[PDB]
Symmetry: D2
């Protein structure tokens, strides 16, 4: 019925054979055949299918109201699988500030295979309509984006994509299936870095893909079986286990996000704050129309580089590390850690100022996270 | 010094920190930074590098006398990584009977990205010289091949490749590093389905790549980090553990192979036998010059389909399943299980007769495997 | 600072060496010594100590405000370890309705070693004072108990134990460290079946023990090293990971418990309800004085056996299985599943009527659990 | 049929449900019941039984020609389980130089429960007959023993035990089921530290017990379920996997043992050598009559402490660590590492001289182990 219930009882995460209430870990590569071609339960070679991976795939399919799930060895492997639906000469539109790893994959790997890529500001959907070429076959959207959390209208992107015969894809990592279901809004394919919120415990690198399209599912399965970026059984198990608490975690993260944003907007040592919950944020109405909660990623400006470094070292409960979506709260400085190769004045142009801090809110006590960040800001 | 010693003491498979005599399993995605950019031991994000994966990579690099190792989520992911060294318009030569999954990847995935592929009979190396085009950039060789175990001269293929500016690649799965070291013979890149002999226990799907070329290594690392077909830490650990016994396993397998081949050549219900140890086999001299042992895969002809099915069901110690390189002995019928989509008369043309049986010799008692197969053959 | 924060940042659950933000899994048995007696980081043999087990032990010690943690292969192994602090001729007081496995261990195993055991109603602490013999050395208390949730005054039990020179022990499984800290109230030793709430995901059988007493800790360590009921590294890792969400899980469980109890008290097909939150419950004041939340175990009477079976099969979100403390809600009938060997009229005497149902509330949506149970009750 | 075959095909180590050729890892604690009391495949709570543990138990039972297997969290937990077959006032005979952990368990833990223990020189079996008291109920034998490898006649010990109504137990760790089967010679119970050869890779701490006695099996199962020293599923899986190569490993170890002993007997810097293969060894005939191979543990005298330390640091392929039975060769000095608490002159009395070195032969190349040890000895 309701979401927290569905997280527990949706999908196939028990053992039909023994009744084990958790998915068995099939640390195995091949399977007995009773006769040539007779598969006991459909399995014959773990790259093609493995029952633990199948359990996690059924989970992501159920949670996104899709029909088919796919588990890859990482988020970028999921993305490469999806991009491989295209041929040389095909063209793909991506939102202009898409994830750095996504941009790198497209422009430094797939353009060598004749995939053409255009980055557009999808915050106005007519931008998409202008960028459509006769060779465009895919529209690829993150919402909200990193690290400034730009929101893209998912439903309109889906309509545009259908009208022009495009495969629509949403990287739903930041929102998770708990808050935003792109397939329900007409999108062809939804994907996730399960490395982040879904696994939720910073201990699995994994990607997940869901679709309701039988033909797209068949092509994805062919690509996964032929290029082989499959998730292993132990990581699939840890993913299923982590997803059990997704709702509780995201709701705690959201309570802290609201309180932390109040604090940041009030504080003198903080200028601009980037988050879709702020009513002045571009397309705040749109986000509210397509999601019923918020991501735990916030960005905000302090004065300069050394204020940011001071902030990092003054906090007791914000940890300096890569990734987002941990049980710990994480802090980072994009201009030094993710956008450092970009020349400084294009960084400034894009809003990636030297004092832009990104935090990924964890599940610590709300008041502790507010107080710790505020006392650290008070030293600036 | 000697090979069985090197299998135990070569590579980094202990913990410098605690002294643990086995590699710790780093079931983790990200890493604390003491300062922005200060990595404690070089780690920052598990897709880029993970210390358990690093342990297995150092093992494959050491065992092939290379400098750089790479661990992928499967053999075909290793192969796709290597093929992605090429650009649209580039051309690759493969041996004509290359692994079905390899052929499928190249002709149904990578040709859509403008990679051109030509299959040649590399058992005569001048075939390679004839097939070279101005656009050829890669030469890809399995030796010996599946399921008829054709041998290709590795050293001459390396010389040819160097003279024409080609990246040379050997799929060394069937021989393993214990018996055949392509990098020692001038090959640029060696790869493995570690799913088979290296893991050795039918419980990991994985690929491994080694090279001595710094620039090729840098490009492989970039491709692995951007397309993300990485092996997880638990599977890397199981790989290291399985490789410990590789020498003992391969030597037992070889003792049984010699005895089983004597039996098969003597038996009336058996026609042709395919294995590089037979002195009448094409390029037997070449194989002996480039390897100091044998693969555990044998193929042999019985009369027809139902003799093969009878054989399978009469044996007590040969198991009907996909894959090769298990501790169990495995039996299969290519014409029904791996070449069934090919029309019957091209199957016959290629030697894939309806009675061609393939066995992958395991580590059971030699006399038991000889006796069990012979008594099963005696029922034909 | 606050509890949800302490769950994330308390204890040692990162890797000092690589910075890995999760505890490495040391799947290892022994450790290199640089010189005879020189242990690099204190490890020499995994039974004596293993760094993953050490991580989980530091977690349980921190969460109970103790000094020493111990991880055993199960709850009953923790209990046997603690009972082995005694010698033949020593006497132990346990609360009269203690866990069936505990009772069985004491009366069918340890009495054969000359341990004498007396069961008393500890809901009145003067019962303890009456039962003290000159040979009594241990007082062992669960609060609240299974399946009728009797509450025992922990602080008074501690005072009594200190005055008469007894080792006081509390089985704190049902409350978890999130809600009840016996060591803070003077108890010598606190233990847990981490199989239940702490692991929280029905995928680890494990026990945990914490103490602040150096001498008791030394004796426990000696017993653990000599009788060897240690938890393995993979299970220790899964325990640490599960404990991360303990607070969020228990708080969701508590919201549903309050609402479900309102429903049960209102429903006509339900007679008595057993839970310490009910103000009419014996020692409700005491529980509130020693805990700041509630267990997720509830018991309640329906009419008879077949009403209970009907109830079980009418619910969609209550699962029929052993154990408690899962993410799923669990349902059971003690008179058939845990007290079936007791004659029927002593069952009735004790309150274990044929219609007594026990539910362990999970983390599903509150309204779904209320509605599902109520609609199932409405069919009676 | 033959032993290497039985290691691969004996026991239940595949999945009946999916056909998976390796045992699934049931990382689970409890199991769905279709009706109260209806267990789908006999499982209801993982402490009582877990299907991965059941797989390893069936393996040890098959390999020792027993009927019932039991897997414990360590060797000493197996031993404590077996000792708990006794009651206060019962008396147990152990061989005089039994494992230090065994001696410590008996004399410092179980004597506090009224178990009486007598150490006798079982190398003459009439010693056993002299030590029998009216209260003796158990006879516990290691053969060969640590670190001087004394041999005890197993068959005569069994006859003696049966005639006087004693439960006979053999710690068969050093020989493994591959070479010595005590149950075949009349022994009631056989046990193993699977931490050593059976797991074989220094990455599992575990114990295994096998018996053919239904009543003893029922009592062991009751003790295991009530005191809870169970092996977890991941460790059970790693045990099954390690046992696959037991025969190949032990045979390599034995080839190196023979050659190393020739070297040691010839070398001037080496005095006495302790190993049952030497024809001058006490009860060499007896060992040959009850085993068809040898343990990989050897002890030998060098001059003094600093010759032993020099030896350790001169070898390249002998590793300084606790335990025995690794793939690596291990070296140790009992007088400093296992017998250091014993006063020096009783050490000398027992033969534990300051220059007594113990090596556990691994699976490195034979000639490398001979040459490395000899060149290290040549520096003395
Ligand atoms: N969307 C929903 O919440 C309803 N819904 C859709 C599929 C499904 C599976 C299990 C459960 Br429980 C609820 C489900
Ligand atoms: N080729 C060899 O056999 C020699 N060799 C080369 C590298 C290396 C590492 C460890 C050991 Br041990 C031996 C090694
Ligand atoms: N009790 C508390 O809540 C305070 N407290 C006590 C130990 C400790 C460790 C980490 C953190 Br964060 C808080 C801690
Ligand atoms: N002793 C033996 O070697 C014969 N034996 C006894 C049990 C058993 C199981 C499988 C196989 Br294969 C052989 C077996
Ligand atoms: Na939505
Ligand atoms: Na649709
Ligand atoms: Na070679
Ligand atoms: Na070279
Ligand atoms: Na408390
Ligand atoms: Na105290
Ligand atoms: Na024997
Ligand atoms: Na017998």
């Amino acid at each position: 019925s309701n979401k927290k219930t569905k997280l527990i009882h949706g999908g196939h995460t028990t053992d039909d054979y023994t009744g084990a209430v958790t998915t068995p870990i099939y640390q195995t590569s091949t399977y007995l055949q009773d006769d040539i071609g007779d598969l006991r339960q459909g399995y014959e070679y773990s790259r093609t299918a493995n029952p633990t991976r199948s359990s996690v795939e059924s989970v992501i399919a159920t949670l996104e109201n899709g029909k088919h799930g796919f588990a890859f060895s990482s988020g970028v492997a999921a993305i490469s699988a999806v991009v491989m639906l295209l041929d040389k000469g095909d063209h793909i539109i991506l939102n202009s500030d898409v994830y750095g790893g996504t941009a790198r994959a497209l422009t430094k790997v797939f353009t060598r295979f004749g995939i053409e890529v255009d980055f557009v500001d999808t915050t106005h959907t007519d931008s998409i309509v202008q960028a459509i070429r006769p060779t465009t076959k895919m529209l690829f959207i993150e919402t909200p984006s990193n690290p400034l959390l730009r929101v893209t209208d998912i439903k309109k992107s889906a309509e545009i994509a259908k009208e022009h015969g495009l495969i629509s894809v949403v990287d739903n990592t930041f929102m998770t299936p708990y808050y935003q279901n792109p397939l329900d809004l007409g999108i062809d394919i939804v994907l996730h870095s399960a490395t982040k919120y879904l696994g939720g415990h910073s201990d699995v690198v994994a990607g997940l893909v869901a679709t309701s399209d039988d033909k797209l599912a068949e092509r994805l399965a062919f690509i996964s079986n032929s290029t082989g970026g499959i998730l292993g059984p132990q990581d699939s198990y840890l993913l299923v286990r982590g997803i059990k608490t997704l709702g509780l975690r995201m709701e705690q993260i959201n309570r802290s996000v609201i309180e932390i944003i109040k604090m940041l907007q009030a504080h003198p040592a903080v200028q601009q704050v980037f988050h879709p919950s702020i009513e002045s944020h571009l397309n705040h109405d749109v986000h509210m129309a397509q999601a019923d909660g918020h991501t735990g990623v916030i960005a905000f400006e302090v004065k300069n580089t050394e204020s940011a470094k001071q902030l990092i070292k003054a906090t007791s409960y914000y940890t300096l590390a890569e990734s987002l979506g941990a049980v710990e709260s994480l802090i980072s400085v994009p201009a030094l850690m993710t956008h450092a190769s970009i020349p400084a004045d294009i960084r400034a142009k894009e809003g990636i100022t030297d004092g832009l801090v990104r935090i990924s809110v964890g599940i610590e006590d709300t008041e502790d996270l507010v107080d710790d960040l505020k006392q650290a800001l008070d030293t600036l």
